[PDB]
Design a protein around this ligand. Structure first.
Ligand SMILES: *[C@@H]1O[C@H](CO)[C@@H](O[C@@H]2O[C@H](CO)[C@@H](O[C@@H]3O[C@H](CO)[C@@H](O[C@@H]4O[C@H](CO)[C@@H](O)[C@H](O)[C@H]4NC(C)=O)[C@H](O)[C@H]3NC(C)=O)[C@H](O)[C@H]2NC(C)=O)[C@H](O)[C@H]1NC(C)=O
Ligand SMILES: *[C@@H]1O[C@H](CO)[C@@H](O[C@@H]2O[C@H](CO)[C@@H](O[C@@H]3O[C@H](CO)[C@@H](O)[C@H](O)[C@H]3NC(C)=O)[C@H](O)[C@H]2NC(C)=O)[C@H](O)[C@H]1NC(C)=O
Ligand SMILES: *[C@@H]1O[C@H](CO)[C@@H](O[C@@H]2O[C@H](CO)[C@@H](O)[C@H](O)[C@H]2NC(C)=O)[C@H](O)[C@H]1NC(C)=O
Ligand SMILES: *[C@@H]1O[C@H](CO)[C@@H](O[C@@H]2O[C@H](CO)[C@@H](O)[C@H](O)[C@H]2NC(C)=O)[C@H](O)[C@H]1NC(C)=O
Ligand SMILES: *[C@@H]1O[C@H](CO)[C@@H](O[C@@H]2O[C@H](CO)[C@@H](O)[C@H](O)[C@H]2NC(C)=O)[C@H](O)[C@H]1NC(C)=O
Ligand SMILES: CC(=O)N[C@@H]1[C@@H](O)[C@H](O)[C@@H](CO)O[C@H]1O
Ligand SMILES: *[C@@H]1O[C@H](CO)[C@@H](O)[C@H](O)[C@H]1NC(C)=O
Ligand SMILES: [Ca+2]
Ligand SMILES: [Ca+2]
Lengths: 48, 96, 48, 948
């Protein structure tokens, strides 16, 4: 899936929209390991 | 035409009504392999028009040729790929 | 003037006057979202 | 076929059997003697029609004078308090403290109230402060709201002072032009909330005088798409700001001007007419070029018609365009050179056209310019035109301050049917020096006070007169403020086909059966003049199944303070009533034991009317605990009754002795009769006794005497009345109840005809079957019908099983011919307050058509031949004496194999009458004589263009 996303960005479809979706203020999937209370931590300023 | 014929016609509907349950509808599973409705009071059946109002589909030679040309031009091919991923599984459409 | 079929929204990439048609032609030449304008033009003449 | 003389022998033998059984078993003559044997426990008092109306008209006039004083008091303080306001711009430390409704803060502090439970209020309220309602679209905590929310805090002192003088006071509300409504007493607000106080009928009627709105709609090619449905929604919301005092029409122009509907001129803009325009404006399409010259000429010419009824008030043109390059200087110069007509222009939709001519057409014509770019701006921009129309009213000053009363409408806070008095509030800051005069041309808001229809009903008592008499009040538009037939439901329009913000405006002619004389009475009542008329009228029954003719007397007078007219309908045999005269204890006490539930065997099951005998004793609408709460009260409260009225208590107690005397002295002698299933007696006092204790349960009748259909039916008729049981298992009434017979007693005390009570029995249908035969004949059919064509007795088994059913639904060929030969008449009416199951394009309100049948000719013998085609059917019909029954004889349906469509007498969901041909000859009405338009001092120097 990561390779498919990178191929999509290489073709230049919505890569800026994906970058916006990868911003720091994003919800975290339940299956990940995170402390209770901080649901919105995943995503980083490294995305740009 | 041989593979994806008449498969973009099943969207999440409402219980015993002709109202689409999504603001941006996507196809359901043609044979229980793709995407299924998750909402408690929604079911999906046939009779849907299509993803882009019926323009983009593979259920005719003209439609298939037009969507193949559009995919070749790099514009909106991921939309068709994701609609295929909703209709059928994840393994066949990505090869095409 | 044939892009008034939706009745629920106003479209920005139209052929209303000369500047707007010129901008739409330029945008199609750039290749970005040309399929959306094609879909609008097809739906303006009776759809599929 | 038997001869005519032979049939009369059959009828006379059975008529004597029926009448004798009904007369002897019920005891009609025994109760008549019982009433006449005493003649000293009660007195006969006259029912003066002229005095009754005038006394009640003065009570209503005084009641509305209570509320006018409150409105004047509230309006005086609101103007004075607001005039001493400084327009603070910061509310950080000087926070505004108030109780906001519909809640579970820059400068606002909330209030937590106690919300005790109070009577005469269907919810929890609080007299400690006043509640504030702010619409969802309006942000609380803004500079405009907070300033409006600070000076309005002084209204609470007057709110409490008003209730101190008059404890029986309903909602008092101040509707601000800002948008927020502050009402007293505080009460939590009632899905999402779309309530705006500026769109309420009472606010709109006080913001401006009536109008002559004419809507011009641009249906040219350029408006197709989003901006077409924006105009259609905008026009529909604009029609919601009109009332029955305003006249409107809608026209569209695209290279040619025409009306969008069938009206062709201005119409009264009531519920029926506004529905037609709303439906017609939703069918318009955009095509062609734009012609403003041909569009305004059509609009200006329709405002100079004067053929028909109008408002003779504000004449406005509301243009719904997007943009254009044509100003039409010549049209405005030619038609309104003196600027006698305002022009309001709306630029609707997201477009890139020229708004210059659109803006200019408003400023030069004393109008305003509005922009509606999207759906979210439709609701706010379609109500702002009342600010412009209110300019001449504020400049009038004191003379433009009169209390106006609205139509009957359902309260938003679930209080029932209410009316509201309205008084506008002006901005008079700097008026003591007359220097600002710029924002002082707009009203601050509207002050309102509610009056319940229950309050009006208390001033018109009905228990001193017969159940067939009643009061009813009228409004200058013809609608009924008070009527027995008015119901707390919205009036429907058309048939609901789906895949309470309007007033309950029910006309007098639609409340009851129309007549030629009634129109003359209504016209006299509308203009206002006392009168009196006695005439013969046909009256519908409580159950919409029977029609009977009886003499009636109408006595009407106008109410002084307001424009309402009060009338009292009072038949004969009711100009005199029985007033109980007994104060001794042991005589009164012995009647109180008769009501003891225990003795429901010796005294027969007893019911009690749920009347308001005393304040503390509350009604229960079950007649099980209420009876228990009655005898316990009468055995616990002293006879003085400081707060309980004794006129009702003496009336019911007197009849308890009168009724039990029939039960004990006469009914107990005949414990069981072969053909009698039950014996009953109903009295004006409000007690019903059924001898078979058992039968008590089978009694599917209202415990209140004044709502019993068979009781009123027996009063008009001077013979035995047979009531057909309801069909389709509407409770147990098929074979375990029987045919109900009733007969009203007639009393002559001093030459005065009195009908205090009715008596009757329930005929055993099985026993009647045996006597009828003395069976399943395939040669001839023998059926007995009542006044109304309902089957009561047959000899074909299958006919008998469907007892109490309309004869047209089981033998349409014979029933249809009977109407033609003029033995059965019928008149059809419309029931506007009815609910029906929706059909294809829960339940919704709709209009239903009711038909009722009654005897037309007075002749008793009817014979003829029915021609159904390729066959022949011969019948003979005789009517039994001293009853409403007709016996007819005809051969079998199988002799002639013809079956036409069945005749239906039931609630039919119709949509009539047609409104396209009622506006040609509309009902007479009188409009307000006050108008506030075209004032010299009006500024009109600001529109939406200069500011926009
Ligand atoms: C009854 O009528 C009186 C006048 O006859 C009226 O009192 C006047 O109210 C207005 C406000 O509506 C005051 O206007 C002052 O001047 C401007 C006008 O808005 C304000 O300055 C900014 O204006 C912009 C818009 O142009 C606005 O967005 C902004 O918020 C304003 N404030 C800023 C930027 O700080 C002034 O703030 C405003 N107030 C002042 C100067 O105190 C008049 O001053 C008032 N005149 C008098 C004599 O009091 C009164 O509101 C009317 N009653 C009701 C209920 O409306
Ligand atoms: C609009 O809001 C204003 C701000 O809250 C209100 O003005 C305040 O009213 C208070 C109640 O009277 C005043 O308190 C007292 O005022 C008297 C009158 O001069 C004086 O004794 C003192 O100023 C004060 N007493 C004390 C503090 O013990 C406030 O002074 C006054 N001004 C403020 C708070 O800035 C208005 O009442 C309000 N308008 C309406 C109609 O309610
Ligand atoms: C009613 O309005 C009409 C115009 O809308 C006025 O004009 C007359 O109309 C009637 C027939 O509709 C005729 O008398 C003539 O055709 C018109 N002219 C005149 C001089 O009468 C009419 O005057 C208005 N009033 C009446 C009573 O018709
Ligand atoms: C409404 O006011 C009028 C007068 O404006 C009242 O007319 C009175 O009629 C009685 C006879 O019925 C006369 O004796 C009085 O002299 C009249 N009043 C005056 C002031 O002259 C009329 O009665 C009032 N309406 C009601 C219901 O009382
Ligand atoms: C109610 O009664 C009958 C319905 O059958 C109608 O009155 C008769 O109408 C006919 C129609 O031409 C007249 O010839 C008769 O003279 C009328 N009978 C009368 C006036 O007694 C009518 O539908 C209703 N009557 C009203 C409204 O007065
Ligand atoms: C002819 C006729 O009316 N038959 C009725 C039927 O309509 C109704 O549904 C049923 C209910 O018990 O009773 C019977
Ligand atoms: C209010 O009405 C009553 C009767 O309806 C009347 O007696 C009274 O004078 C009126 N005014 C006040 C202030 O009670
Ligand atoms: Ca692209
Ligand atoms: Ca146009």
């Amino acid at each position: 899936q990561a390779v498919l996303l990178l191929f999509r960005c290489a073709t230049g479809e919505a890569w800026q929209e994906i970058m916006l979706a990868c911003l720091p203020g994003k919800l975290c999937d339940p299956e990940s390991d995170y402390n209770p209370g901080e649901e919105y931590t995943c995503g980083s300023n490294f995305a740009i | 035409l041989e593979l994806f014929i008449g498969k973009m016609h099943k969207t999440c509907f409402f219980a015993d009504s002709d109202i689409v349950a999504e603001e941006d509808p996507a196809p359901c599973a043609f044979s229980g392999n793709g995407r299924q409705c998750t909402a408690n009071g929604t079911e999906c059946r046939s009779g849907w028009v299509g993803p882009n109002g019926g323009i983009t589909n593979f259920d005719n030679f003209a439609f298939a040729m037009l969507t193949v040309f559009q995919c070749i031009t790099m514009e909106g091919w991921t939309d068709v790929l994701y609609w295929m991923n909703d209709a059928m599984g994840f393994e066949l459409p990505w090869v095409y | 003037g044939k892009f008034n079929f939706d009745e629920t929204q106003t479209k920005r990439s139209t052929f209303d006057n000369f500047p707007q048609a010129l901008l739409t032609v330029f945008q199609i030449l750039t290749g970005e979202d040309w399929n959306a304008v094609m879909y609008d033009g097809i739906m303006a003449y009776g759809g599929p | 076929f038997p001869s005519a003389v032979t049939i009369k022998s059959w009828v006379d033998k059975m008529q004597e059997d029926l009448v004798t059984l009904a007369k002897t078993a019920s005891g009609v003559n025994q109760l008549v003697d019982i009433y006449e044997k005493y003649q000293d426990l009660y007195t006969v008092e006259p029912n003066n029609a002229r005095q009754l109306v005038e006394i009640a008209a003065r009570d209503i006039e005084k009641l509305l004078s209570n509320r006018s004083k409150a409105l004047v008091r509230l309006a005086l303080e609101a103007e004075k308090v607001q005039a001493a306001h400084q327009w603070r711009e910061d509310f950080a430390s000087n926070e505004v403290v108030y109780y906001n409704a519909k809640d579970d803060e820059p400068g606002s502090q909330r209030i937590k109230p106690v919300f005790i439970e109070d009577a005469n209020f269907g919810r929890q309220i609080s007299y400690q402060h006043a509640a504030v309602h702010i619409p969802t679209d309006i942000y609380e905590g803004s500079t405009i709201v907070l300033n409006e929310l600070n000076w309005t805090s002084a209204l609470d002192e007057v709110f409490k002072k008003n209730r101190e003088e008059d404890p029986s006071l309903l909602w008092q509300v101040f509707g601000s032009a800002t948008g927020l409504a502050r009402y007293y007493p505080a009460s939590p607000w009632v899905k999402i909330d779309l309530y705006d106080v500026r769109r309420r009928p009472w606010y709109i009627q006080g913001a401006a005088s009536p109008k002559d709105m004419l809507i011009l709609v641009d249906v040219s090619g350029s408006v197709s798409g989003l901006t077409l449905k924006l105009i259609r929604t905008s026009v529909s919301e604009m029609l919601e700001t009109l009332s029955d005092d305003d006249f409107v029409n809608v026209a569209s122009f695209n290279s040619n001007a025409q009306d969008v509907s069938c009206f062709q001129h201005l119409v009264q803009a009531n519920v029926r007419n506004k529905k037609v325009l709303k439906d017609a404006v939703n069918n318009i399409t955009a095509k062609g070029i734009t012609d403003y010259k041909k569009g305004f000429s059509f609009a200006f010419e329709q405002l100079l018609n004067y053929n028909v009824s109008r408002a003779n008030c504000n004449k406005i043109i509301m243009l719904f365009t997007d943009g254009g390059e044509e100003r039409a200087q010549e049209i405005f110069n030619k038609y309104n050179k003196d600027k006698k007509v305002r022009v309001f222009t709306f630029s609707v939709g997201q477009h890139n056209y020229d708004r210059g001519p659109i803006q200019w057409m408003a400023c030069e014509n004393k109008g305003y310019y509005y922009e509606i770019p999207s759906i979210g701006a439709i609701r706010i921009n379609t109500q702002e035109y009342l600010d412009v129309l209110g300019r001449p009213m504020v400049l009038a000053g004191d003379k433009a301050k009169q209390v106006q009363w609205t139509n009957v409408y359902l309260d938003a806070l679930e209080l029932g049917l209410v009316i509201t008095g309205t008084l506008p509030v002006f901005n008079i800051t700097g008026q003591f020096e007359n220097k600002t005069n710029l924002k002082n041309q707009l009203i601050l808001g509207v002050m309102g006070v509610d009056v319940s229809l229950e309050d009006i009903k208390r001033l018109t008592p009905r228990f001193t007169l017969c159940p067939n008499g009643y009061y009813f009040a009228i409004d200058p538009n013809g609608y009924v403020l008070l009527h027995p037939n008015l119901q707390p439901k919205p009036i429907g329009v058309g048939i609901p086909t789906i895949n309470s913000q309007e007033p309950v405006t029910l006309d007098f002619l639609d409340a009851e059966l129309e007549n030629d004389i009634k129109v003359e009475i209504r016209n006299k009542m509308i203009d206002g003049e006392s009168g009196e008329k006695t005439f013969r009228t046909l009256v519908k029954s409580q159950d919409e199944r029977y029609i009977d003719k009886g003499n009636r007397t109408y006595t009407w007078t106008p109410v002084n303070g307001t424009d309402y007219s009060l009338a009292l309908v009072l038949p004969t045999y009711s100009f005199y009533y029985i007033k109980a005269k007994l104060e001794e204890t042991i005589t009164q006490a012995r009647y109180s034991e008769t009501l003891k539930p225990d003795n429901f065997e010796e005294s027969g099951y007893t019911f009690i009317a749920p009347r308001d005998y005393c304040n503390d004793l509350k009604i229960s609408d079950n007649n099980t605990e209420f009876l228990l709460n009655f005898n316990e009260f009468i055995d616990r409260k002293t006879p003085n009754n400081p707060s309980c009225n004794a006129d009702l208590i003496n009336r019911v107690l007197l009849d308890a002795g009168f009724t039990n005397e029939l039960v004990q002295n006469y009914w107990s002698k005949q414990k069981n009769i072969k053909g009698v299933k039950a014996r009953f007696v109903v009295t004006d006092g409000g007690i019903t006794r059924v001898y078979p204790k058992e039968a008590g349960e089978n009694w599917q009748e209202n415990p209140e005497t004044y709502e019993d259909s068979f009781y009123k039916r027996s009063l008009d008729n001077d013979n035995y009345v047979f009531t057909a049981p309801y069909f389709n298992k509407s409770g147990p009434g098929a074979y375990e109840s029987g045919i109900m017979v009733s007969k009203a007693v007639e009393i002559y005390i001093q030459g005065k005809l009195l009908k205090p009570a009715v008596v009757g029995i329930k005929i055993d249908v099985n026993s009647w079957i045996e006597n009828f035969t003395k069976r399943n004949s395939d040669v001839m059919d023998c059926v007995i019908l009542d006044d109304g064509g309902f089957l009561l007795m047959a000899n074909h088994d299958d006919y008998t099983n469907q007892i109490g059913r309309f004869f047209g639904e089981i033998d349409p060929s014979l029933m249809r011919h009977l109407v033609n030969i003029s033995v059965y008449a019928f008149n059809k009416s419309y029931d506007y307050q009815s609910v029906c199951e929706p059909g294809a394009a829960s339940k919704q309100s709709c209009i239903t058509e009711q038909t009722q049948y009654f005897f037309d000719n007075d002749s008793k013998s009817f014979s003829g031949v029915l021609d159904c085609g390729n066959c022949s059917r011969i019948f003979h019909g005789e009517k039994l004496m001293n009853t409403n029954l007709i016996f007819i004889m005809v051969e079998s349906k199988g002799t002639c194999p013809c079956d036409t469509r069945l005749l239906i007498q039931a609630e039919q969901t119709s949509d009539g009458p047609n409104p396209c041909d009622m506006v040609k000859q509309p009902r007479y009405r009188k409009g307000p004589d006050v108008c506030f338009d075209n004032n010299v001092l009006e500024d009109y120097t600001d529109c939406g263009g200069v500011s926009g």
